[PDB]
Amino acid sequence: AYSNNSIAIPTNFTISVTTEILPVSMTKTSVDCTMYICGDSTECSNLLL
Amino acid sequence: YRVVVLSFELLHAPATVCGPKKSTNLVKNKCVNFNFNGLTGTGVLTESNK
Ligand SMILES: *[C@@H]1O[C@H](CO)[C@@H](O)[C@H](O)[C@H]1NC(C)=O
């Protein structure tokens, strides 16, 4: 409610604490390209190129 | 002309036949290509307890 004259003022307070999770880093995998695509094969180095 | 039509197995697994092929010492855990009755594979072969 309100009219030409009114206002609300707090009388007491209350300290509060709240968490805020935040990702920072992610475990980084090191995946190569040849083996995965092609293992040890004679034609591996010719058709790959 | 004898036109009798015959048909062998069409893409079936090994059976009671065994072609004229020799044998050699098996591979336990070597990271090499292997041959056991035609099937060929590469990579690393590791033994499990399944
Ligand atoms: C704290 O808040 C209560 C109501 O929750 C109030 O009665 C009290 O007056 C407040 N503290 C002080 C010092 O006034």
GROMACS .gro file of C-alpha atoms and ligand atoms in nm:
model
  113
    1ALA     CA    1   0.000   0.000   0.000
    2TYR     CA    2   0.093   0.367  -0.032
    3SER     CA    3  -0.040   0.721  -0.059
    4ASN     CA    4   0.116   1.067  -0.089
    5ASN     CA    5   0.306   0.987   0.234
    6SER     CA    6   0.442   0.645   0.331
    7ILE     CA    7   0.763   0.437   0.342
    8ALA     CA    8   0.894   0.110   0.486
    9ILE     CA    9   1.218   0.088   0.684
   10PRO     CA   10   1.376  -0.231   0.824
   11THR     CA   11   1.427  -0.265   1.198
   12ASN     CA   12   1.642  -0.580   1.218
   13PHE     CA   13   1.878  -0.760   0.979
   14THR     CA   14   2.005  -1.114   0.918
   15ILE     CA   15   2.343  -1.214   0.776
   16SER     CA   16   2.317  -1.492   0.518
   17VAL     CA   17   2.561  -1.716   0.331
   18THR     CA   18   2.498  -1.886  -0.004
   19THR     CA   19   2.721  -2.096  -0.227
   20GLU     CA   20   2.780  -2.037  -0.598
   21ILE     CA   21   2.948  -2.326  -0.778
   22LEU     CA   22   3.150  -2.244  -1.089
   23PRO     CA   23   3.338  -2.481  -1.322
   24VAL     CA   24   3.697  -2.372  -1.382
   25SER     CA   25   3.888  -2.655  -1.553
   26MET     CA   26   3.796  -2.985  -1.715
   27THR     CA   27   4.013  -3.297  -1.724
   28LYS     CA   28   4.170  -3.272  -2.069
   29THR     CA   29   4.225  -3.589  -2.269
   30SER     CA   30   4.505  -3.617  -2.525
   31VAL     CA   31   4.364  -3.819  -2.812
   32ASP     CA   32   4.595  -3.872  -3.109
   33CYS     CA   33   4.476  -3.900  -3.470
   34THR     CA   34   4.649  -4.189  -3.656
   35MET     CA   35   4.608  -4.497  -3.425
   36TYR     CA   36   4.241  -4.410  -3.355
   37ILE     CA   37   4.165  -4.348  -3.727
   38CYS     CA   38   4.414  -4.625  -3.828
   39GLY     CA   39   4.631  -4.862  -3.622
   40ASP     CA   40   4.948  -5.039  -3.736
   41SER     CA   41   4.883  -5.136  -4.098
   42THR     CA   42   5.097  -5.141  -4.411
   43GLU     CA   43   4.847  -4.928  -4.606
   44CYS     CA   44   4.802  -4.702  -4.305
   45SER     CA   45   5.062  -4.443  -4.413
   46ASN     CA   46   4.971  -4.445  -4.784
   47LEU     CA   47   4.592  -4.413  -4.786
   48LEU     CA   48   4.607  -4.174  -4.489
   49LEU     CA   49   4.806  -3.917  -4.689
   50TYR     CA   50   2.610  -7.916  -7.069
   51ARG     CA   51   2.554  -8.010  -6.704
   52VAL     CA   52   2.410  -7.692  -6.551
   53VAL     CA   53   2.357  -7.838  -6.204
   54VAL     CA   54   2.380  -7.542  -5.967
   55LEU     CA   55   2.571  -7.592  -5.641
   56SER     CA   56   2.610  -7.363  -5.340
   57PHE     CA   57   2.848  -7.368  -5.044
   58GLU     CA   58   2.822  -7.168  -4.722
   59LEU     CA   59   2.760  -6.796  -4.778
   60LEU     CA   60   2.938  -6.601  -4.502
   61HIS     CA   61   2.913  -6.850  -4.216
   62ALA     CA   62   3.153  -6.911  -3.928
   63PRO     CA   63   3.399  -7.203  -3.913
   64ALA     CA   64   3.247  -7.550  -3.938
   65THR     CA   65   3.350  -7.916  -3.952
   66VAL     CA   66   3.578  -7.835  -4.251
   67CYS     CA   67   3.940  -7.725  -4.207
   68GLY     CA   68   4.131  -7.605  -4.512
   69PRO     CA   69   4.488  -7.718  -4.578
   70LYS     CA   70   4.660  -7.469  -4.347
   71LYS     CA   71   4.946  -7.503  -4.100
   72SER     CA   72   4.980  -7.395  -3.736
   73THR     CA   73   5.219  -7.179  -3.535
   74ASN     CA   74   5.282  -7.075  -3.176
   75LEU     CA   75   5.002  -6.857  -3.042
   76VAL     CA   76   5.030  -6.501  -2.909
   77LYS     CA   77   4.938  -6.435  -2.546
   78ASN     CA   78   4.952  -6.057  -2.499
   79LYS     CA   79   5.165  -5.926  -2.788
   80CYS     CA   80   5.045  -5.599  -2.942
   81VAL     CA   81   5.062  -5.739  -3.296
   82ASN     CA   82   4.829  -5.858  -3.569
   83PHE     CA   83   4.714  -6.217  -3.519
   84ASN     CA   84   4.562  -6.494  -3.729
   85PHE     CA   85   4.350  -6.775  -3.580
   86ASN     CA   86   4.145  -6.951  -3.849
   87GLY     CA   87   4.124  -6.658  -4.089
   88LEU     CA   88   4.020  -6.389  -3.843
   89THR     CA   89   4.285  -6.116  -3.827
   90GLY     CA   90   4.317  -5.843  -3.566
   91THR     CA   91   4.556  -5.575  -3.448
   92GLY     CA   92   4.610  -5.347  -3.149
   93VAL     CA   93   4.680  -5.488  -2.802
   94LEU     CA   94   4.543  -5.822  -2.681
   95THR     CA   95   4.484  -5.827  -2.305
   96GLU     CA   96   4.362  -6.120  -2.096
   97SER     CA   97   4.055  -6.077  -1.875
   98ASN     CA   98   3.888  -6.305  -1.620
   99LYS     CA   99   3.544  -6.315  -1.784
  100LIG     C1  100   1.581  -0.854   1.552
  100LIG     O1  101   1.464  -0.894   1.483
  100LIG     C2  102   1.353  -0.917   1.572
  100LIG     C3  103   1.241  -0.975   1.489
  100LIG     O2  104   1.286  -1.086   1.413
  100LIG     C4  105   1.316  -0.786   1.641
  100LIG     O3  106   1.210  -0.811   1.734
  100LIG     C5  107   1.437  -0.729   1.715
  100LIG     O4  108   1.406  -0.600   1.766
  100LIG     C6  109   1.557  -0.719   1.621
  100LIG     N1  110   1.675  -0.676   1.693
  100LIG     C7  111   1.683  -0.560   1.759
  100LIG     C8  112   1.813  -0.532   1.828
  100LIG     O5  113   1.588  -0.482   1.764
   0.00000   0.00000   0.00000
